[PDB]
C-alpha cells in the first residue's frame, strides 16, 4: 500500500498492459473534455516514468505519491490549451486539495455526442488496422462518459469487446453477427456503470458503513454458506476496493481487487462451491466471474431466526454492547435465508429490527415489546411485491415503448421541475427494468426489480444534486439510501407546480432530426411527450397521444421535403393550433 516507490510498485503488480489501461482511464475520468491525443500523451509520459522507476527506484519523481504524479503531469498541460479547460484553478492548490478539486469536477453527464457506432465493416476494419489505438479509443470514450465506471470491469469489457470483434469480423456478414452481440455488451456495461455509480454515491454521500451494510447483505445471499467472519472480511476488503476506485485511485483499486479474487480462490472450500468456475480463469475474467456469481444454495441445518434475535435473553445486551457486530450478524443471518429478497428490502427490514430494539430495549419488559418484530416485517415485504405485480402486468400489456410512455407521464407529473432530458433518460431506464425482470418467475422478480430501480433512482439522484430544481427529489434522494424507491413510489402528481406555457414548436429544429435512426427518433417523441405533460399536466392520455401523433406526422411531412427547414417554421405553428384545439 505504501511502498518506497508507488508507481513502480503498481506497474510491477499490475503489468504494463493493465497499467497503461488504468492510467488512460484515470485521465479520461479526471478530464472528460480533453481530446484523445492529450490523454495518450499523458499516458505515455506516466508509463515512461513508471519504466524509469522500475529500472531504478531512486530515479527522479519515483518517491512521489501517485496523486502528486497524475497532478504534476496534468498541470504541465495548461500548455495544450485550457480554454474548454475551465478548472486549472485546481492546479492552484497543493495536495491533498489539488486532487480533491479534480475529483469534484467529474461530470455525470458531460456535454458529448452520443457514442456513435460505425457500420460493422468499418468497425471491423478499424480493429484490424490497429488494436491499440482501437482499444485506447474505447477506454477513453467509455471512461469519459462514465467517470465513475468500475475501472477493472472496464478493462474486462474491453477484452470482451475484443473477443466479439475477433469472432464476428471474419464472417463476411458482419452486422448480423456483430451488432446483436454488441448491443448486449452495451446494455450490460450500462448496468455495471449504474451499479458502480450507486456504490460510489453510497460511500460518498452516506459513508463507508452504508456500502458495508449493502455489501454484507449481497455477499450473505451469494455465499450463504460462508461464516460471518469470512463474509465480514470480504466485505472489508471490498469496501476498500470501492473507496479507492470511486475516488480515482484505479491502480490501487485494481491491484487490491486482484488481491481479493486471489484470496477468494485460495479459500473457496470455505466460501462457495460455485467458485470452481471462476478460479480457473485469467485475472479479469476471474474477478468478473466472482463479481456476478449466482447465489450458492443455502445450507441445510440452520436454526430458526427468532432463536437468536427474539428468544435469547441477551438481545438487548448485544444490541447495546456491540451494536454493529450484533446488527451485522442479523443482516448476515437473515439475508442468507432469503435470496428472493432485494438487498434494499433486507436492509429496510434490518432498519425496522433496529428501530424496534431501540424503542423496546428502553422499556420495562423489552421482550414483550419486541416479541412481534420478525412478524411485523410482513407489510414491508408485501409493499414491493405489489409494485412488481401491478407494473409487470402493465409492461406485458403495453410493451416497451408504451410502458416507457406511461412511466414518462407518471414521472413527469410527480417531479415536473426535473429537466426534460433527465426525465426522458430515467423513464426509459425504468422501462428497461420491465424487459429485464418481468420475464422471470414471480420469485425472482423482486430482487431483480427493486435492486435495478435502486440503481436507476440513484442516476436521478446524481443528475439532480448538481442542479437541484425539485424539493421532492432532493428529499427522496437525501433522506435514505434504502427507502428511496418507496419514497419516489409514494409521490402523487405534484399539484404545487405551475404549468409551463407553450414553448413555440421547440422541436422544429433546423432538422438534423431527419438523419436520426428510429431509436433517436423515439427519444424525440418522448421528449415532446414530456414537454406536453409539463404544459398540460391534467391532459388525458388520449389527448397526449393525439398531439404526439401530429408530432410524428409533422416529422414525416417536413422530412419528406427539399429545403427541410422551410415547412418546419410553417407546420409547427399549425401543430400549435392542432395542440390547443386538442388539449385546449
- Is residue 452 included in any domain, yes or no? yes
The annotated binding site for (4Z,15Z)-bilirubin IXalpha is made up of 240
The contacts of residue 554 (CB under 8 Å, 6+ apart) are 571, 572, 575
C-alpha cell at 86: 475551465
Does 349 lie in the same domain as 313? Answer: yes
Residue 451 and residue 527: Cα distance in Å, rounded? 27
- Is residue 577 included in any domain, yes or no? no
Name which of 46, 52, 5, 48 is nearest 22 in CA terms: 46
> Is 526 exposed, middle or buried, given 0-12, 13-18 or 19+ CB atoms closer than 10 A?
buried
Does 481 lie in the same domain as 401? Answer: yes
Name which of 319, 251, 340, 330 is nearest 19 in CA terms: 251
SS3 state of residue 118: coil
C-alpha cell at 137: 479509443
The annotated binding site is made up of 3, 6, 13, 67, 240, 244, 247, 249, 252, 255, 259
The contacts of residue 271 (CB under 8 Å, 6+ apart) are 223, 225, 226, 230, 264
Does 534 lie in the same domain as 455? Answer: no
Does 394 lie in the same domain as 474? Answer: yes
Q: How determined?
A: X-ray
Q: Domain tally for the chain?
A: 6
Q: What is the CATH number of the domain that holds 237?
A: 1.10.246.10
The annotated binding site for Zn(2+) is made up of 67, 247, 249
C-alpha cell at 64: 512521489
Does 303 lie in the same domain as 283? Answer: no
Residue 294 and residue 224: Cα distance in Å, rounded? 11
- What range does the domain containing 243 cover? 205-296
Resolution of the experimentally solved model in angstroms: 2.3
Out of 197, 218, 243, a domain closes at: 197
The annotated binding site for Ca(2+) is made up of 6, 13, 244, 252, 255, 259
Residue 201's H or E segment, with its range, is: helix 174-201
Does 336 lie in the same domain as 255? Answer: no
- Is residue 135 included in any domain, yes or no? yes
Residue reference for cell 504534476: 72
C-alpha cell at 341: 429478497
The annotated binding site for Cu cation is made up of 3
Out of 272, 296, 320, a domain closes at: 296
Residue 242 and residue 212: Cα distance in Å, rounded? 10
The terminus-to-terminus CA distance of the chain in angstroms comes to 67
Cα separations in angstroms, 533 against 228, 457, 467, 528? 51, 21, 21, 9
- Is residue 470 included in any domain, yes or no? yes
Out of 107, 131, 156, a domain closes at: 107
Residue 317's H or E segment, with its range, is: helix 315-321
> Is 65 exposed, middle or buried, given 0-12, 13-18 or 19+ CB atoms closer than 10 A?
middle
C-alpha cell at 410: 407518471
Does 466 lie in the same domain as 455? Answer: yes
Amino acid at each position: 500500500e505504501a511502498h518506497k516507490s508507488e508507481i513502480a510498485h503498481r506497474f510491477n503488480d499490475v503489468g504494463e498492459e493493465h497499467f497503461i489501461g488504468l492510467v488512460l482511464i484515470t485521465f479520461s475520468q479526471y478530464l472528460q473534455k480533453c481530446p484523445y491525443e492529450e490523454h495518450a500523451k499523458l499516458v505515455k509520459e506516466v508509463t515512461d516514468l513508471a519504466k524509469a522507476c522500475v529500472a531504478d527506484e531512486s530515479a527522479a519523481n519515483c518517491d512521489k505519491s501517485l496523486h502528486d504524479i497524475f497532478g504534476d503531469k496534468i498541470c504541465a498541460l495548461p500548455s495544450l490549451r485550457d480554454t474548454y479547460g475551465d478548472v486549472a484553478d485546481c492546479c492552484e492548490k497543493k495536495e491533498p486539495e489539488r486532487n480533491e478539486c479534480f475529483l469534484h469536477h467529474k461530470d455525470d453527464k458531460p456535454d458529448l455526442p452520443p457514442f456513435a457506432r460505425p457500420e460493422a465493416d468499418v468497425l471491423c476494419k478499424a480493429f484490424h488496422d490497429d488494436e491499440k489505438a482501437f482499444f485506447g479509443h474505447y477506454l477513453y470514450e467509455v471512461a469519459r462518459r462514465h467517470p465513475y465506471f468500475y475501472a477493472p470491469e472496464l478493462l474486462y469489457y474491453a477484452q470482451k469487446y475484443k473477443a466479439i470483434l475477433t469472432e464476428c469480423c471474419e464472417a463476411a456478414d458482419k452486422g448480423a453477427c456483430l451488432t446483436p452481440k454488441l448491443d448486449a455488451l452495451k446494455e450490460k456495461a450500462l448496468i455495471s456503470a449504474a451499479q458502480e455509480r450507486l456504490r460510489c454515491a453510497s460511500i460518498q454521500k452516506f459513508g463507508d458503513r452504508a456500502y458495508k451494510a449493502w455489501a454484507l447483505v449481497r455477499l450473505s445471499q451469494r455465499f450463504p454458506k460462508a461464516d460471518f467472519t469470512d463474509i465480514s472480511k470480504i466485505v472489508t476488503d471490498l469496501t476498500k476496493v470501492h473507496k479507492e476506485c470511486c475516488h480515482g485511485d484505479l491502480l490501487e483499486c485494481a491491484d487490491d481487487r486482484a488481491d481479493l479474487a486471489k484470496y477468494m480462490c485460495e479459500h473457496q472450500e470455505t466460501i462457495s462451491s460455485h467458485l470452481k468456475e471462476c478460479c480457473d480463469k485469467p485475472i479479469l475474467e476471474k474477478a468478473h466471474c466472482i463479481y456476478g456469481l449466482h447465489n450458492d444454495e443455502t445450507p441445510a441445518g440452520l436454526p430458526a431466526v427468532a432463536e437468536e434475535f427474539v428468544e435469547d435473553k441477551d438481545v438487548c445486551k448485544n444490541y447495546e454492547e456491540a451494536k454493529d457486530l450484533f446488527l451485522g450478524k442479523f443482516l448476515y443471518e437473515y439475508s442468507r435465508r432469503h435470496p428472493d429478497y432485494s438487498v434494499v428490502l433486507l436492509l429496510r427490514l434490518g432498519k425496522a429490527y433496529e428501530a424496534t430494539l431501540k424503542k423496546c430495549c428502553a422499556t420495562d419488559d423489552p421482550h414483550a415489546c419486541y416479541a412481534k418484530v420478525l412478524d411485523e416485517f410482513q407489510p414491508l415485504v408485501d409493499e414491493p411485491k405489489n409494485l412488481v405485480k401491478q407494473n409487470c402486468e402493465l409492461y406485458e400489456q403495453l410493451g416497451d415503448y408504451n410502458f416507457q410512455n406511461a412511466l414518462l407521464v407518471r414521472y413527469t407529473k410527480k417531479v415536473p421541475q426535473v429537466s426534460t432530458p433527465t426525465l426522458v433518460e430515467i423513464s426509459r431506464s425504468l422501462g428497461k427494468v420491465g424487459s429485464k425482470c418481468c420475464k422471470h418467475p414471480e420469485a425472482e422478480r423482486l430482487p431483480c426489480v427493486e435492486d435495478y430501480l435502486s440503481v436507476v433512482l440513484n442516476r436521478l439522484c446524481v443528475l439532480h444534486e448538481k442542479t437541484p430544481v425539485s424539493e421532492k427529489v432532493t428529499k427522496c434522494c437525501s433522506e435514505s439510501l434504502v427507502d428511496r424507491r418507496p419514497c419516489f413510489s409514494a409521490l402523487g402528481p405534484d399539484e404545487t407546480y405551475v404549468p409551463k406555457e407553450f414553448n413555440a414548436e421547440t422541436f422544429t429544429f433546423h432538422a438534423d432530426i431527419c438523419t436520426l435512426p428510429e431509436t433517436e427518433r423515439k427519444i424525440k417523441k418522448q421528449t415532446a411527450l414530456v414537454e406536453l405533460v409539463k404544459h398540460k399536466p391534467h391532459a388525458t392520455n388520449d389527448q397526449l397521444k393525439t398531439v404526439v401523433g401530429e408530432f410524428t406526422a409533422l416529422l414525416d411531412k417536413c422530412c419528406s421535403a427539399e429545403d427541410k427547414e422551410a415547412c418546419f417554421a410553417v407546420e409547427g405553428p399549425k401543430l400549435v393550433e392542432s395542440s390547443k384545439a386538442t388539449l385546449g
